[PDB]
Amino acid sequence: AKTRSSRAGLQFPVGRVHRLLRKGNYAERVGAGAPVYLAAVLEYLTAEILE
DNA sequence: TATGCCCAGCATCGTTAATCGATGTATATATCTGACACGTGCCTGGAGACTAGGGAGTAATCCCCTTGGCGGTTAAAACGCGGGGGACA
Numbered sequence: 731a732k733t734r735s736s737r738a739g740l741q742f743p744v745g746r747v748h749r750l751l752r753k754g755n756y757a758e759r760v761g762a763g764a765p766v767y768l769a770a771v772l773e774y775l776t777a778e779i780l781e
Numbered sequence: 782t783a784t785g786c787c788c789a790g791c792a793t794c795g796t797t798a799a800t801c802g803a804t805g806t807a808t809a810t811a812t813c814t815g816a817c818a819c820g821t822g823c824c825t826g827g828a829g830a831c832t833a834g835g836g837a838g839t840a841a842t843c844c845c846c847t848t849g850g851c852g853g854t855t856a857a858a859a860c861g862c863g864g865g866g867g868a869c870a
């Protein structure tokens with residue numbers, strides 16, 4: 731698969747959330763599966779609420 | 782001439798049948814709006830690939846801090862008793 735989201739099996743945007751973690755000054759280095767983890771998390775929450 | 786008798790004459794009641802119209806019920810067609818999927822076009826904000834560097838991992842040593850044990854006084858917790866004054870109706 732090309733799309734990252736799909737390599738991690740998800741609907742949430744892997745790379746759009748990565749950049750948002752660099753345009754928010756939150757820190758000097760951005761982690762590699764953080765982004766995903768985080769995307770996926772919210773994903774659940776949304777669901778949880780949206781369910 | 783007046784009084785019972787013959788011959789029409791429309792409205793009284795009821796019943797039958799045809800007709801215009803309303804109500805109920807399909808049945809295939811022509812709008813209405815609200816789309817969600819696709820292709821149109823374009824931006825680049827992500828992906829992809831490579832590099833370089835310094836953070837963070839780990840490992841090896843140190844030594845400070847935290848836990849422990851103990852026993853003596855000495856205040857504190859514990860108890861009760863009693864009755865007043867605040868809660869509650």
